[PDB]
Scaffold this active site. Structure first.
Site, short mmCIF file in Angstrom:
data_model
loop_
_atom_site.label_atom_id
_atom_site.label_comp_id
_atom_site.label_asym_id
_atom_site.label_seq_id
_atom_site.Cartn_x
_atom_site.Cartn_y
_atom_site.Cartn_z
N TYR A 194 3.14 9.90 -0.41
CA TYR A 194 4.10 9.33 0.54
C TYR A 194 5.54 9.72 0.15
CZ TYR A 194 0.18 6.44 2.30
OH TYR A 194 -0.99 5.94 2.81
N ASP A 201 0.85 -1.21 0.00
CA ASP A 201 0.00 0.00 0.00
C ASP A 201 0.88 1.25 0.00
OD1 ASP A 201 -2.96 1.05 0.35
OD2 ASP A 201 -1.65 2.23 1.73
N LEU A 234 -3.59 -0.86 14.04
CA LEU A 234 -3.10 -0.93 15.44
C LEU A 234 -3.27 0.44 16.13
CD1 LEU A 234 0.19 -2.94 14.74
CD2 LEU A 234 -2.15 -3.79 15.11
N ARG A 277 9.92 -2.58 10.99
CA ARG A 277 10.99 -3.46 11.49
C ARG A 277 10.61 -4.92 11.26
NH1 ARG A 277 13.17 -0.36 16.25
NH2 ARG A 277 11.54 1.12 16.91
N1 LIG Z 1 -5.98 5.95 3.15
C1 LIG Z 1 -5.43 6.76 4.05
O1 LIG Z 1 -5.74 7.94 4.08
C2 LIG Z 1 -4.40 6.28 5.07
C3 LIG Z 1 -4.13 6.98 6.26
C4 LIG Z 1 -3.15 6.48 7.15
C5 LIG Z 1 -2.45 5.31 6.85
N2 LIG Z 1 -2.73 4.63 5.67
C6 LIG Z 1 -2.03 3.37 5.26
O2 LIG Z 1 -2.17 2.40 6.30
C7 LIG Z 1 -0.90 2.13 6.90
C8 LIG Z 1 -1.06 1.88 8.41
O3 LIG Z 1 -1.38 3.09 9.04
P1 LIG Z 1 -0.55 3.65 10.29
O4 LIG Z 1 0.93 3.50 10.04
O5 LIG Z 1 -1.16 5.03 10.45
O6 LIG Z 1 -0.99 2.80 11.59
P2 LIG Z 1 -0.61 1.29 12.15
O7 LIG Z 1 -0.17 0.28 11.15
O8 LIG Z 1 -1.71 0.96 13.09
O9 LIG Z 1 0.58 1.78 13.15
C9 LIG Z 1 1.97 1.66 12.83
C10 LIG Z 1 2.79 1.76 14.09
O10 LIG Z 1 2.66 0.53 14.84
C11 LIG Z 1 3.94 -0.08 14.96
N3 LIG Z 1 3.81 -1.55 14.84
C12 LIG Z 1 3.63 -2.36 13.76
N4 LIG Z 1 3.56 -3.64 14.15
C13 LIG Z 1 3.71 -3.65 15.47
C14 LIG Z 1 3.77 -4.67 16.52
N5 LIG Z 1 3.62 -5.96 16.18
N6 LIG Z 1 3.94 -4.25 17.80
C15 LIG Z 1 4.09 -2.94 18.15
N7 LIG Z 1 4.05 -1.96 17.25
C16 LIG Z 1 3.87 -2.26 15.94
C17 LIG Z 1 4.85 0.56 13.93
O11 LIG Z 1 6.15 0.55 14.48
P3 LIG Z 1 7.43 0.32 13.50
O12 LIG Z 1 7.17 1.08 12.20
O13 LIG Z 1 8.60 0.82 14.34
O14 LIG Z 1 7.37 -1.17 13.26
C18 LIG Z 1 4.27 1.96 13.77
O15 LIG Z 1 4.78 2.90 14.73
C19 LIG Z 1 0.04 3.25 6.40
O16 LIG Z 1 1.40 2.91 6.23
C20 LIG Z 1 -0.53 3.54 5.04
O17 LIG Z 1 0.00 2.63 4.04
C21 LIG Z 1 -3.68 5.12 4.82
#
Ligand SMILES: NC(=O)c1ccc[n+]([C@@H]2O[C@H](COP(=O)([O-])OP(=O)(O)OC[C@H]3O[C@@H](n4cnc5c(N)ncnc54)[C@H](OP(=O)(O)O)[C@@H]3O)[C@@H](O)[C@H]2O)c1
Ligand SMILES: CC(=C\c1ccccc1)/C=C1/SC(=S)N(CC(=O)O)C1=O
Ligand SMILES: [Cl-]
Ligand SMILES: [Cl-]
Length: 274
Positions: free
Chosen positions: A58, A53, A201, A247
Site C-alpha cells: 500500500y 488493515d 461494499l 471520509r
Molecule cells: N487482501 C486483498 O488482496 C485486498 C484487496 C482489496 C482490498 N483490501 C482491503 O480491504 C479494504 C476495502 O476494499 P475496497 O476499498 O476495495 O472496497 P470497499 O470498502 O467496498 O469500497 C470503498 C469505497 O466505498 C466508499 N465508501 C465507504 N463507505 C461508504 C458509505 N457509507 N457510502 C458510500 N460509499 C462508501 C469509499 O469512499 P470514500 O473512500 O470516499 O469514503 C470507497 O470509494 C481495502 O482498503 C484494503 O484494506 C484487501
C-alpha cells in the site's frame, strides 16, 4: 463497534476493520496529503476503528508510514494492526526482511496479524509459513493468516503451518459470492477460521436489481444501501468486514451499520441476490 472472536484465539476484534488502500498513494507513494491522511486515521481510531488493515504494498510502503504516525497518539496495545507480505517476498529471507521493514515503517515492535497477501505457486507454502512462524517465535507477529486463498489452498496452508491460521481475507460482498460457491465460508465456520471480507461494499459498484432489493430493506431500517450491505456480512458467523472509508461521513455511517438487526426474511432475500 461490534466485536467478534478471531479464529479460536479467545480474543475478540472489531468486526469492522479500517481499510487503508489509497491512503498515502496506491501502487506508489503520494506525499501530497500526508497531514490530512494522518488526521483522518486518528479520527477513525478515536471513533472506534482500532482494527487497521494495511500491507507493505500500500502506497509503496507509505501507507504504513502514515499509519505509523497516526498510531503514536494512542496506546499500541489498544490497536489491532494487520499487515501483509506481497507474493514476490514469500521466500524465507525476503519474508523476514519484508516483516522487519513493515515494522520500521509502522514504527512498532510487532504486528497483531501478518497475512500472505496473495499466493505465489512458485514458492513452497511450507517455506513461507515456517518463515512466518519464525516471526511469531521472535515476538514480531502475534497471529498469522492468509489472503486470497480459496478453500483448498486454505486447507493446504493449515496442513503445512506450525502456527494456527486464524483468518482468510477474501473478496466478499452482496454481489461477489465466490466464498459461498467455493465452500470457503462454510469451511471457516466449521473450522474456527475468521473470514475477513474485503471490498465489502464492492467499491459501491452494484447492479440495478440488487439496488432495488437493498433500497426496500434500507428504507425499512432508515439506513443507506451500504449500511445494509455491511449488516448483511456482519450477521454471518465468522465474518468480519474491512470497508475502505476515506471520509468521516463514511466512517460514521459504517459504524452505525453494526447496530442494524436484519430479520430472517431480510437475510433470505439478501442471500438470494447471488
Ligand atoms: N487482501 C486483498 O488482496 C485486498 C484487496 C482489496 C482490498 N483490501 C482491503 O480491504 C479494504 C476495502 O476494499 P475496497 O476499498 O476495495 O472496497 P470497499 O470498502 O467496498 O469500497 C470503498 C469505497 O466505498 C466508499 N465508501 C465507504 N463507505 C461508504 C458509505 N457509507 N457510502 C458510500 N460509499 C462508501 C469509499 O469512499 P470514500 O473512500 O470516499 O469514503 C470507497 O470509494 C481495502 O482498503 C484494503 O484494506 C484487501
Ligand atoms: C484489483 C485492484 C487492487 S490492486 C491491490 S494491491 N489492491 C488492494 C489489495 O490487493 O489489497 C486492489 O484492490
Ligand atoms: Cl499479484
Ligand atoms: Cl468504515
Amino acid at each position: 463497534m461490534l466485536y467478534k472472536e478471531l479464529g479460536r484465539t479467545g480474543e475478540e476484534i472489531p468486526a469492522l476493520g479500517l481499510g487503508t488502500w489509497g491512503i498515502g498513494g496506491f501502487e506508489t507513494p503520494d506525499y501530497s496529503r500526508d497531514e490530512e491522511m494522518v488526521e483522518l486515521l486518528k479520527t477513525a481510531i478515536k471513533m472506534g476503528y482500532t482494527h487497521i488493515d494495511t500491507a507493505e504494498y500500500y502506497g509503496g510502503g507509505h501507507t504504513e508510514e502514515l499509519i505509523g504516525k497516526a498510531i503514536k497518539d494512542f496506546r499500541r496495545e489498544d490497536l489491532f494492526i494487520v499487515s501483509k507480505v506481497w507474493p514476490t517476498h514469500l521466500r524465507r529471507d525476503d519474508l523476514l526482511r519484508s516483516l522487519e521493514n513493515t515494522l520500521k515503517r509502522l514504527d512498532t515492535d510487532y504486528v497483531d496479524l501478518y497475512l500472505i497477501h496473495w499466493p505465489n505457486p512458485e514458492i513452497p507454502l511450507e517455506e513461507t509459513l515456517s518463515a512466518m512462524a519464525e516471526g511469531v517465535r521472535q515476538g514480531l507477529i502475534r497471529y498469522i493468516g492468509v489472503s486470497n486463498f480459496d478453500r483448498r489452498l486454505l486447507e493446504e496452508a493449515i496442513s503445512k503451518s506450525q502456527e494456527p491460521i486464524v483468518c482468510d481475507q477474501v473478496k466478499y460482498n452482496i454481489e461477489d459470492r465466490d466464498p459461498e460457491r467455493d465452500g470457503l465460508l462454510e469451511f471457516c465456520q466449521k473450522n474456527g477460521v475468521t473470514l475477513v471480507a474485503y471490498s465489502p461494499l464492492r467499491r459501491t459498484l452494484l447492479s440495478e436489481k440488487t439496488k432495488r432489493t437493498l433500497e426496500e430493506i434500507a428504507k425499512n431500517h432508515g439506513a443507506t444501501i451500504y449500511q445494509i450491505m455491511l449488516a448483511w456480512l456482519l450477521a454471518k458467523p465468522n465474518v468480519v468486514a474491512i470497508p475502505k472509508a476515506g471520509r468521516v461521513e463514511h466512517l460514521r455511517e459504517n459504524l452505525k451499520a453494526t447496530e442494524i438487526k436484519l430479520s430472517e426474511e431480510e437475510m433470505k432475500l439478501l442471500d438470494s441476490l447471488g
